[PDB]
Design an enzyme around this catalytic site. Structure first.
Site, PDB file in Angstrom:
ATOM      1  N   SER A   1      39.700  65.068  49.996  1.00 41.44           N
ATOM      2  CA  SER A   1      38.800  66.211  50.076  1.00 41.44           C
ATOM      3  C   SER A   1      39.491  67.422  50.721  1.00 41.44           C
ATOM      4  O   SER A   1      40.460  67.925  50.143  1.00 41.44           O
ATOM      5  CB  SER A   1      37.497  65.812  50.713  1.00 41.44           C
ATOM      6  OG  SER A   1      36.545  66.846  50.504  1.00 41.44           O
TER       7      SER A   1
ATOM      8  N   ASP B   1      30.636  63.714  41.907  1.00 37.91           N
ATOM      9  CA  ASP B   1      31.166  64.495  43.009  1.00 37.91           C
ATOM     10  C   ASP B   1      31.136  65.960  42.562  1.00 37.91           C
ATOM     11  O   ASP B   1      31.635  66.256  41.477  1.00 37.91           O
ATOM     12  CB  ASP B   1      32.589  64.040  43.323  1.00 37.91           C
ATOM     13  CG  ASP B   1      33.270  64.770  44.469  1.00 37.91           C
ATOM     14  OD1 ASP B   1      32.669  65.745  44.979  1.00 37.91           O
ATOM     15  OD2 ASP B   1      34.364  64.304  44.882  1.00 37.91           O
TER      16      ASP B   1
ATOM     17  N   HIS C   1      31.692  61.272  45.916  1.00 35.20           N
ATOM     18  CA  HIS C   1      32.648  61.824  46.857  1.00 35.20           C
ATOM     19  C   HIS C   1      32.764  60.944  48.090  1.00 35.20           C
ATOM     20  O   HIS C   1      31.745  60.421  48.577  1.00 35.20           O
ATOM     21  CB  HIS C   1      32.153  63.200  47.304  1.00 35.20           C
ATOM     22  CG  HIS C   1      33.145  63.953  48.109  1.00 35.20           C
ATOM     23  ND1 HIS C   1      34.187  64.663  47.566  1.00 35.20           N
ATOM     24  CD2 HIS C   1      33.224  64.087  49.451  1.00 35.20           C
ATOM     25  CE1 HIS C   1      34.876  65.202  48.586  1.00 35.20           C
ATOM     26  NE2 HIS C   1      34.303  64.868  49.740  1.00 35.20           N
TER      27      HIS C   1
END
Ligand SMILES: O=C(O)c1ccccc1C(=O)O
Ligand SMILES: O=C(O)c1ccccc1C(=O)O
Length: 297
Positions: A147, A241, A271
């Site tokens: 991320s 996501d 995610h």
């Protein structure tokens, strides 16, 4: 493709900055209690960067099988996370790949602003490259992150030639790469899939200096027009996501720029799944990492 059943169950079961940070860490501890990490030898240290000392933890595999150090940058929106929150992932990367891994505690926002952690993450990668021969390893490093940490890995990779930093590969786990453009996934999975619109906006408010920074390539590496010659890339996405589409589009752009690229979407996933060891897909993705890295040499 349907949501994964265990993911579906997880979503169904569900303050100050200091308190928000503590809550994030508590959640990570809980998942690690549910599915304990493998034992692994570690050594804590501190790297002198251009923005101050940065704590690191070096992971030593039981059996060293991969000839480059990994340098791993945790996610957390640039605001949350630490070496401990991401130990479950890093311990597994270390032992499954058989790689030494340097997990980095870069400076968090809003106390530190863009582009401070980028600079620190370059400095730590450079340190690792310089140390590698004394560990019996090649100087060229593999950068990795999830991320916000995948953002950092991608930016470090784009800066590497200019910074005289040898990088053998980049591993981007559901990275954030484009803070300017809305994509279909960002519209369609904006609410209800763990990483939400409101939070992404707030993270940006903490990290960036002004709203104009969204167009800076060190914030939005997907905007960079020339991707030729970048390090071989593994880009792992989750189907549900908001960040999926920018990740997959970057992988396609790398591929078309002649960069050896493996793009893997984990269907039915959300995610964050590679720090959530309740899902077997986390280990599957770690195996994908090992298989990818087998091809680097
Ligand atoms: O960067 C992120 O998406 C993120 C945001 C909030 C908590 C955790 C994470 C994480 O990746 O570990
Ligand atoms: O554009 C984003 O998604 C984003 C923007 C700023 C900070 C953090 C993120 C993130 O999700 O980690």
């Amino acid at each position: 493709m349907p949501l994964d059943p265990r993911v579906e169950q997880f979503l169904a079961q569900m303050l100050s900055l200091a308190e928000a940070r503590q809550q994030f860490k508590q959640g990570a501890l809980l998942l690690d209690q549910m599915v304990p990490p493998p034992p692994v030898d570690t050594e804590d240290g501190t790297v002198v960067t251009t923005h101050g000392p940065v704590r690191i933890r070096r992971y030593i595999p039981d059996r060293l099988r991969f000839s480059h150090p990994l340098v791993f940058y945790h996610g957390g929106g640039f605001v949350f996370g630490d070496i401990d929150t991401h130990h479950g992932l890093v311990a597994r990367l270390c032992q499954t790949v058989g790689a030494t891994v340097i997990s980095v505690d870069y400076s968090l926002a809003p106390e530190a602003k863009f582009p401070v952690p980028v600079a620190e993450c370059i400095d730590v990668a450079r340190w690792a490259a310089h140390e590698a021969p004394g560990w019996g390893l090649k100087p060229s490093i593999v950068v990795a992150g999830d991320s916000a940490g995948g953002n950092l890995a991608a930016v470090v990779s784009q800066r590497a030639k200019d910074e005289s930093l040898p990088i053998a590969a980049q591993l981007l786990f559901y990275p954030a790469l484009d803070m300017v453009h809305e994509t279909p996934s960002k519209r369609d999975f904006a609410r209800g899939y763990l990483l939400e619109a409101d939070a992404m906006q707030w993270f940006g408010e903490q990290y960036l200096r002004t709203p104009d920074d969204v167009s800076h390539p060190w914030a939005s590496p997907a905007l960079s027009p020339d991707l030729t010659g970048l390090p071989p890339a593994l880009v792992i996405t989750a189907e549900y996501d908001p960040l999926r589409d920018e990740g997959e589009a970057y992988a396609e752009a790398l591929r078309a720029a002649g960069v050896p690229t493996e793009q893997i979407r984990f269907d039915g996933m959300i995610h964050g799944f590679m720090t959530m060891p309740i899902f077997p897909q986390m280990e599957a993705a770690i195996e994908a990492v090992a298989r990818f890295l087998e091809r680097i040499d």
